[PDB]
Design a protein around this ligand. Structure first.
Ligand SMILES: *[C@@H]1O[C@H](CO)[C@@H](O[C@@H]2O[C@H](CO)[C@@H](O[C@@H]3O[C@H](CO)[C@@H](O)[C@H](O)[C@H]3NC(C)=O)[C@H](O)[C@H]2NC(C)=O)[C@H](O)[C@H]1NC(C)=O
Ligand SMILES: *[C@H]1O[C@H](CO)[C@@H](O[C@@H]2O[C@H](CO)[C@@H](O[C@@H]3O[C@H](CO)[C@@H](O)[C@H](O)[C@H]3NC(C)=O)[C@H](O)[C@H]2NC(C)=O)[C@H](O)[C@H]1NC(C)=O
Ligand SMILES: *[C@@H]1O[C@H](CO)[C@@H](O)[C@H](O)[C@H]1NC(C)=O
Ligand SMILES: *[C@@H]1O[C@H](CO)[C@@H](O)[C@H](O)[C@H]1NC(C)=O
Ligand SMILES: *[C@H]1O[C@H](CO)[C@@H](O)[C@H](O)[C@H]1NC(C)=O
Ligand SMILES: [Ca+2]
Ligand SMILES: [Ca+2]
Ligand SMILES: [Ca+2]
Ligand SMILES: [Ca+2]
Ligand SMILES: [Cl-]
Ligand SMILES: [Cl-]
Ligand SMILES: [Cl-]
Ligand SMILES: [Cu+2]
Ligand SMILES: [Cu+2]
Lengths: 633, 633
């Protein structure tokens, strides 16, 4: 099991090894301060593909099982963040700093994600030193400390306007013990500068209150005293062992990236591998509004972590009561492994739609079919307000469906001015702001082996004389085919035109002489790429494409980075860089899919948005890969 | 029950009345000859909407219940086809010829659909007088009358190259007891001219045999005698009463149009009507190939009948064993009513995806959700080789999903020459020819009443200085909104761009000041419109649009016609005619959706193609139609 996530035991071992080997004093990350040194996280380091295949296919010994550790080195003249490969598990003996060889240089400290202790300290500052200065205005709008509901804060990101910044607009909301505290904005937002290593030097650089901007809370309060601020009062058949799933028809290895999310490796249909890896790479949301956080937010969720933020699947609600559930173990912001109970679930679903069927007239007595049962692998990420359920469903005919379903609660903004220009009013003093939802997937298809080619097939109409009546013409329907040659030709612009039939194929043909292939059919209602003029769109440049094929490279494991979120102006990973006109004829190919939709909140979204529809994502379908409809057991 | 399809009793009554009022000159259509007079079909005549609404909403007496009869008047100097409104049911007293007032003039005789007795006679001619003339070439390729498999014919359409023609290329295939006879072409096709009223004057105007054309079968045979033709040997929670479905949340009336297919009327959510009618209008397929039938076929299925050709749903396969099944009754090509057992089925499906859910960190103890159970109304049309399952699914949040799933067997063509230019080889001597699958729906939404407006909403980015940092800009995401004014502006070109949020709205707003609305979200992978240069594309001009909104007109009940198939060059109904720049501001609006996909057959399609995916069609979703998430029972 070389693709299995590190276990509770391996997580503890690496940690012990790190404490022992790291000369600079370490602090439990759950309690670390900017200036401390701490281990931010440790998880599996995926092995090199060649070594993994030599093992899986040729029985060579397994590749050294390694872990990747992200260390925040804040206690030093020039703090940095460092990635260390530690291995070979069970008992490590080396610790390799690979930061520079993977990024060209050091990782600046302001790129590290904000720590939970950092959030807790920002909150102590806001509730103990900041808000009381505006007690008067706060009693008026919100019964602050006078029986009114408790207040709580809401993060936003990126944090600033250029590289180096760590200034975040935190919004103030009623802690209504109900469906979404973020559905009750107060209209108060604070720009706190928390870039300094000593929290004692943090400050609020600006404040936004119900439509107006102020220098600080003391100015808001004193102008309110002077009767100059109008305050609005705000009311209220298969088995699973280790990391492998096995069914009569399918077989694959599953896992969860702490930052990347759900992933699957070594997918095989009837013994034949169709893909080395299929995994989530990034999920994002771009917001609009006339209040600070709504107008500035551009999320690249791996910065928080689709794995880290994964939640327990509710039996009977998220998965069937009789589904098989599996646990996940991780070490993120703690020096002891945590286990996430019921992080995954696998079960068989009856689509209630006949898979195959045909009927006829009389004394042709042989018509019927079978129902369509599919195998589902599921997990759920809960990022602040939205819940993302990730699906990978395997069909009995060799097809795979990968989908994203968004549910949860929407984040709201205090309504004022030209608010409707940025969304819809969904309550009193509340606007539901516009945003897009995007997801990116890495699809490493190895069709009939490693060496693949990309084919673009479509239709065309060409008028031609009718043979049996030459005086008449007929718009002749036909298929068009072109073997793509370079990456540039296989980078299809979001919302643009792309071949209706696009597939990756091996050199060998099926019995009938057609290239064996697996095509990709995307399903999305994406909203329109962010203009490249944005000083930060390169950090999520995967959003420029609906689909893109490049050469699989050991040096390009991901289309995004945990480090992009707190510094999109100078991205740590710019997916578009992977597209550099290389040949895609007979190479190990990787397909990357973008899927998403536009969300203009509406009244039906309150108190919670529902999963109506079949999600967003893609299908991988066999196209002349077999010589006929494949068997089924 | 004014939307209910005519019952066996009413069907018998209308028929008795017609025999009585039309006298002796009548023959059972099951046995009629071109020159005979016969009743082709009788079914419900939908009532005027105003009268129906006055009855459903104001308790006015119901509209006269009537039937529409299509009579073939072939026994006369100038044969024609006539539509007669017969009524009031139970005991009819009048018979109104409405042909001229609905079409501007008489329906020419060659437009009538080919009768089953007509097909049977074409077959007697082919097997008794034609093929024997080529016994020698047929012995060789197919062991004709020497122990080889029986042969059978395959229809194609249109029939000719211009208005007035009734010449059809019939293909010859092995009749195999297995997975589809049309999967075994012989390479032999015959153009039979059956326009003449006396079958005795019918002739084969041309023959195609394995790549070459001939004048007739005697020429094929004698040239083969002359050792000049090389012959390839070819081997081998709710209740349903009457026509109304009732559930805790939904209520609607269902039915099946003999030619139009599944249909639903008076759809109500929590007592409020969302749509007067949602129904199938047409389904089509455009083929390509280098053999006669595949290069000429352009199907407009209503010409045969999605209702007429509907098949019994297989319990346990097409619908769950415990679903509720309903029968359908019809009079098509018979003088006695026929009943189609299990023509519909209704049941509750668990999508296996949580409808709503949210989770959190600690001591916010109130996270969970409910599973998503949906109501399904289903029926299946079996058109020759294709099986079309029509779904209408009603969600508990007010949303409706309408889909088409294609399954069954592909029609094949004998492989020769440039075959691969028109499809993929899927067997020995067999090509699976390219084709598109299209379906058109009539969606008569009455959002908050009859008077509706169309809104186009989308997103846009506009760079704006950052208030708290004026030296910096930010691509500001926002919503754009435009009230469409005329039909021309709401006719969105297939494959073109269209607003991401398009909805029909009433004059009244919801509690938050936004127009109450239902948006249409289409889901298709259509192939590209037939060029308007085609002398026949006007007959299916609905294929030009992804979506179109027009004024509901009593005079424009359907976007197609049973009579278009045998005469597309001079269509009886040209949908684009409905788009004539009228106002769409505050009128009874009707939305028409087109959905489809491209199908390049592949090996996996043999012996039968599967329904992997979620079909093609559209979603109708509430957009500020409610004041919050609707309740659920
Ligand atoms: C399509 O064919 C229809 C069937 O033949 C035509 O309709 C028929 O036209 C006849 C000729 O006008 C009518 O006959 C008349 O019937 C009355 C009342 O029954 C007799 O008293 C009259 O003598 C006779 N007219 C005369 C003196 O010739 C039929 O009543 C009528 N049948 C029906 C069922 O409508 C259509 O006219 C033809 N359509 C078009 C547009 O040409
Ligand atoms: C920022 O992050 C790391 C934390 O300081 C830096 O890595 C450390 O660099 C030190 C000096 O460059 C190394 O010290 C060496 O340790 C060995 C023991 O193996 C001593 O004998 C040497 O005298 C001492 N000096 C040198 C230069 O070798 C640390 O061992 C090393 N720690 C790790 C885990 O690598 C990174 O260099 C820095 N990042 C960047 C890119 O600048
Ligand atoms: C096909 O063969 C079966 C078996 O005899 C028979 O029922 C059928 O009528 C034959 N021809 C056609 C066109 O169905
Ligand atoms: C990529 O290379 C091809 C030749 O192989 C060239 O024609 C094309 O213009 C190049 N595109 C770019 C990105 O320069
Ligand atoms: C409506 O559109 C037609 C062409 O589509 C144009 O000729 C006409 O002037 C337009 N009239 C309107 C709606 O102003
Ligand atoms: Ca590259
Ligand atoms: Ca590959
Ligand atoms: Ca009109
Ligand atoms: Ca309407
Ligand atoms: Cl498939
Ligand atoms: Cl921006
Ligand atoms: Cl919805
Ligand atoms: Cu959203
Ligand atoms: Cu098809």
């Amino acid at each position: 099991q070389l693709f299995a996530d590190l276990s509770r035991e391996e997580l503890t071992t690496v940690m012990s090894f790190l404490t022992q080997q790291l000369g600079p004093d370490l602090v439990d990350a759950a309690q670390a301060r900017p200036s401390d040194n701490c281990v931010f996280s440790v998880e599996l380091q995926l092995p090199p593909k060649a070594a993994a295949l030599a093992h899986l296919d040729r029985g060579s010994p397994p590749p050294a099982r390694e872990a990747l550790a992200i260390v925040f080195f804040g206690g030093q003249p020039q703090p940095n963040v460092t990635e260390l490969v530690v291995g070979p598990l069970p008992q490590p003996s080396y610790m390799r700093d690979v930061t520079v060889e993977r990024h060209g240089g050091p990782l600046p400290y302001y790129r590290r994600p904000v720590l939970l202790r950092e959030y807790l300290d920002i909150d102590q500052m806001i509730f103990n030193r900041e808000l009381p200065q505006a007690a008067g205005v706060l009693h008026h709008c919100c019964s602050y400390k006078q029986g009114g509901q408790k207040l709580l804060t809401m993060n936003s990101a990126p944090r600033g306007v250029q590289s180096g910044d760590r200034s975040t607009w935190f919004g103030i909301y009623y802690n209504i013990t109900k469906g979404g505290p973020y559905l009750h904005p107060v209209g108060l937002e604070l720009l706190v500068d928390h870039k300094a290593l000593d929290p004692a030097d943090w400050t609020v650089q600006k404040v936004f209150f119900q439509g107006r901007y102020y220098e600080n809370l003391a100015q808001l309060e004193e102008q309110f005293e002077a009767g100059q601020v109008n305050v609005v009062v705000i009311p209220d058949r298969f088995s699973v062992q280790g990391n492998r799933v096995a069914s009569s028809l399918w077989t694959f290895s599953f896992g969860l990236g702490a930052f990347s999310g759900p992933r699957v490796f070594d997918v095989r249909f009837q013994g034949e591998r169709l893909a080395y890896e299929i995994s989530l790479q990034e999920a994002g949301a771009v917001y609009g509004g006339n209040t600070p956080a709504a107008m500035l937010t551009r999320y690249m969720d791996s910065g928080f972590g689709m794995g880290y933020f994964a939640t327990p699947l509710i039996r009977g609600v998220d998965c069937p009561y009789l589904a098989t559930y599996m646990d996940w173990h991780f070490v993120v912001e703690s020096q002891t492994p945590k286990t996430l109970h019921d992080a995954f679930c696998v079960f068989e679903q009856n689509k209630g739609l006949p898979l195959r069927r045909h009927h006829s007239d009389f004394l042709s007595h042989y018509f019927g079919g079978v129902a369509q049962t599919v195998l589902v692998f599921r997990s759920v990420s809960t990022m602040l307000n939205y819940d993302y359920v990730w699906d990978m469903v395997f069909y009995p005919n060799g097809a795979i469906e990968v989908k994203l379903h968004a549910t949860g609660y929407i984040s709201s903004a205090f309504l004022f001015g030209a608010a409707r220009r940025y969304g819809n009013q969904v309550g009193e003093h509340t606007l539901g702001p516009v945003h897009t939802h995007s997801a990116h997937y890495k699809v490493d298809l190895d069709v009939g082996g490693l060496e693949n080619w990309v084919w673009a097939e479509d239709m065309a109409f060409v008028p031609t004389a009718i043979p049996w009546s030459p005086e008449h013409q007929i718009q002749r329907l036909q298929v068009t085919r072109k073997q793509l040659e370079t990456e540039e030709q296989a980078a299809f612009p979001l919302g643009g035109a792309s071949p209706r039939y696009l597939y990756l194929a091996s050199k060998q043909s099926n019995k009938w002489g057609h290239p064996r292939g697996y095509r990709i059919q995307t399903v999305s209602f994406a909203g329109g790429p962010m203009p490249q003029n944005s000083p930060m769109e390169r950090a999520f440049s995967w959003g420029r494409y609906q689909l893109a094929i490049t050469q699989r490279k050991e040096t390009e494991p991901s289309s995004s980075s945990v480090f992009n979120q707190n510094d999109p102006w100078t991205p740590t990973v710019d997916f578009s860089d992977f597209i550099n006109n290389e040949t895609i004829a007979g190479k190990d190919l990787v397909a990357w899919v973008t899927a998403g939709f536009l969300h203009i909140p509406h009244a039906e979204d309150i108190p919670n948005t529902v999963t109506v529809g079949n999600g967003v994502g893609f299908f991988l379908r066999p196209y002349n890969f077999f010589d006929q409809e494949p068997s089924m057991d």
